[PDB]
């Protein structure tokens, strides 16, 4: 099915001749390596509404109202308002069946979008808390859902998992999450922190234990523009010794951090639309990915939470092309960096490079 663009062919495409719908056929055929996407918040509008109606969760609400009430598609005030609506959305984590269904839906849609390498991340405590589910059984449902789809797809998309410890919901427990990550070392390729952006320095020992056991780190940092300084970024880099940074857009505010990230070969996982919708960037026109890219910082393109925003990865490419003048060449380059920085087994990484790059 998917006829992926090859580096050789990029000179033959003239995007300026195409309508938006048309450019979408081009974005889909970019062989995409996506590093930053929350599985637990990865769904289409049709899937989300089906889940609400399945459990008769909002019988007083029309479809439009459900989406408005639960999601962030029209954006909101801050990372802070985001966390509060994420909590409502956990209304869908009703049982292990819907969770396995979600994993299947999410993998299948990434495949249809032209994603070839997909690292999903999820927070066990976030999925479990609402209906007090068992995290072992949650993780089994997700694993089984993923394996079913990839095998059905004759492994045309390669998928791995990262574990998230988080801050912001009632059952949040970073240590529990790290222990769980290590117990399932076999399934998890990385460990992350999300939710409220805190300075993770105070969890140094937990992150050192994870990292030293052989599980690399990529934490959310340098996202929230309401924080008074860049302490969280310094801690991620110097204390947690991360290999990648979720967002990292505030690196753009500091010449010293730009130098440090280049010097340390750290990649920033940029989620452009997420940044605009949470007001961490004024507009796509002024998004720091442009400045970061031009300064020599390694960056990749990510969707973050397709369910909360009601977008998919190809929306992010469209925005980058349209508002910030990125080229097909840039996109192939960012995707190869992302493959290079991926936490997946290197044999798998070799195949993908052979196949697409
Ligand atoms: C404490 S609830 C917020 C939850 O939603 C997750 N999250 C989803 N999208 C993002 C999240 N966390 C932090 N920054 C905003 C965005 O990247 C986070 O991992 C956490 O699991
Ligand atoms: Zn994220």
From Swiss-Prot:
This is Adenosine deaminase. Its EC number is 3.5.4.4, 3.5.4.31. Binds 1 zinc ion per subunit. It catalyses: adenosine + H2O + H(+) = inosine + NH4(+); S-methyl-5'-thioadenosine + H2O + H(+) = S-methyl-5'-thioinosine + NH4(+). Keywords: Hydrolase, Metal-binding, Purine salvage, Zinc. InterPro entries: A/AMP_deam_AS (IPR006650), A_deaminase_dom (IPR001365), Ado/ade_deaminase (IPR006330), Metal_Hydrolase (IPR032466). The gene is ADA. It comes from Plasmodium vivax (strain Salvador I). Pathway: Purine metabolism; purine nucleoside salvage. GO terms for cellular component: cytosol; external side of plasma membrane. A purine D-ribonucleoside binds at residues 38-40, 166, 195, 223, 247, 304. Belongs to the metallo-dependent hydrolases superfamily. Adenosine and AMP deaminases family. Changing residue 166 to A: Loss of S-methyl-5'-thioadenosine deaminase activity. Slight decrease in adenosine deaminase activity. Zn(2+) binds at residues 36, 38, 220, 304. The keyword Acyltransferase does not apply. The keyword Transcription regulation does not apply. Gene3D superfamilies: Metal-dependent hydrolases (3.20.20.140). Catalyzes the hydrolytic deamination of adenosine to produce inosine. Unlike mammalian adenosine deaminases, also catalyzes the deamination of 5'-methylthioadenosine (MTA), a by-product of polyamine biosynthesis, to produce 5'-methylthioinosine (MTI). Plays an essential role in the purine salvage pathway which allows the parasite to use host cell purines for the synthesis of nucleic acids. Residues 164-178 are annotated as: Gating helix loop. Inhibited by coformycin and methylthiocoformycin (MT-coformycin). GO terms for molecular function: 5'-methylthioadenosine deaminase activity; adenosine deaminase activity; metal ion binding. It is an enzyme of class 3 (hydrolase). The record marks 166 as: Important for substrate specificity for S-methyl-5'-thioadenosine.
């Amino acid at each position: 099915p998917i006829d992926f663009l090859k580096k050789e062919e990029l000179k033959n495409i003239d995007l300026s001749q195409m309508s938006k719908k048309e450019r979408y056929k081009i974005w889909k055929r970019i062989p995409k390596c996506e590093l930053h996407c929350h599985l637990d918040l990865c769904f289409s509008a049709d899937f989300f509404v089906s889940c609400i109606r399945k459990y008769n969760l909002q019988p007083n609400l029309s479809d439009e109202e459900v989406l408005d009430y639960y999601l962030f598609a029209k954006g909101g005030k801050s990372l802070g308002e985001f966390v509060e609506k994420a909590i409502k959305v956990a209304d869908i984590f009703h049982d292990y069946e819907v969770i396995e269904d979600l994993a299947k839906h999410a993998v299948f849609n990434k495949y249809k979008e032209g994603v070839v390498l997909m690292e999903f991340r999820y927070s066990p405590t976030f999925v479990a808390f609402k209906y007090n589910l068992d995290i072992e059984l949650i993780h089994q449902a997700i694993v089984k859902g993923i394996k079913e789809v990839v095998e059905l797809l004759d492994h045309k998309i390669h998928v791995a998992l990262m574990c998230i410890g988080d801050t912001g919901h009632e059952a949040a427990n970073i240590k529990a999450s790290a222990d769980f990550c290590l117990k399932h070392k076999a399934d998890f390729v990385g460990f992350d922190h999300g939710g409220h952006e805190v300075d993770l320095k105070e969890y140094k020992e937990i992150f050192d234990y994870v990292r030293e056991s052989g599980v690399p780190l990529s934490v959310h940092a340098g996202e929230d523009v309401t924080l008074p300084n860049l302490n969280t970024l310094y801690s991620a880099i110097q204390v947690l010794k991360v290999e990648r940074i979720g967002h990292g857009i505030r690196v753009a505010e500091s010449q010293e951090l730009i130098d440090m990230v280049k010097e340390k070969n750290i990649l920033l996982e940029v989620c452009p639309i997420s940044n605009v919708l949470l007001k961490n960037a004024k507009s796509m026109d002024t998004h720091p990915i442009r400045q970061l890219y031009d300064a020599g910082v390694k960056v990749s393109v990510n969707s973050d939470d397709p369910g909360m925003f009601l977008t998919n990865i190809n929306d992010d490419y469209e925005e980058l092309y349209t508002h910030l003048n990125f080229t097909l060449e840039d996109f192939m380059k960012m995707n190869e960096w992302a493959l290079e920085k991926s936490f997946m087994d290197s044999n798998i990484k070799d195949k993908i490079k052979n196949l697409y790059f």
